[PDB]
Structure 1
């Protein structure tokens, strides 16, 4: 649902650290978090050049945040769950 993107969130410390490397607020929308995380992934080239939907994060703080070595950007509910576990809904 498009509504979930409007959710107001306060990132936990590790996610806040990651967000500050790409964008400096106390409160974000889920929309903002998704775009900042997306830019983090793209900027750092964490995705497979020949398999672009797969993000590899075992050697990155993003893997610590998410608790996985990798994931597909197509795994939408999983992405939301991994993100939600790193924040407090306001």
Structure 2
């Protein structure tokens, strides 16, 4: 969906995103957009933030993810919206 070169962007997470990344096994200061996404996805799976019936819907209010994204819920299919929500929380290198 999102172009591969955008997927390959080297990025440095701001402290709060780094913190969520590191609670799901992350061990570095510098990441590609791809690695950020994997780890955020692992967070969502571990914490079971998805709707049982419609599993592409995520609920993230009163949660670190909520703090980062600025929305209470979203569909995981709207990639451009997710990328926009991610970009707020990092520095492109």
TM-score band w.r.t. shorter chain: over 0.9
- SS of residue matched to 2:12: strand
Give the whole-Å Cα distance in 2 for the aligned partners of 1:16 and 1:59: 18
- CA deviation after TM superposition for structure 1 residue 52, in Å: 0.2
- 1:65-80 matches, cutoff 5 A: 65-80=68-83
Unmatched tracts of structure 1, length 5 or more: none
Give the whole-Å Cα distance in 2 for the aligned partners of 1:3 and 1:41: 25
**Count of matched residue pairs:** 90
CA RMSD of aligned residues (A): 0.7
Give the whole-Å Cα distance in 1 for the aligned partners of 2:6 and 2:52: 30
Deviations 1:10-66 (Å, cap 9, x if unpaired)? 000100100000122110011100000000001110000111010100021100000
Unmatched tracts of structure 2, length 5 or more: none
Moved over 2 A (4+): none
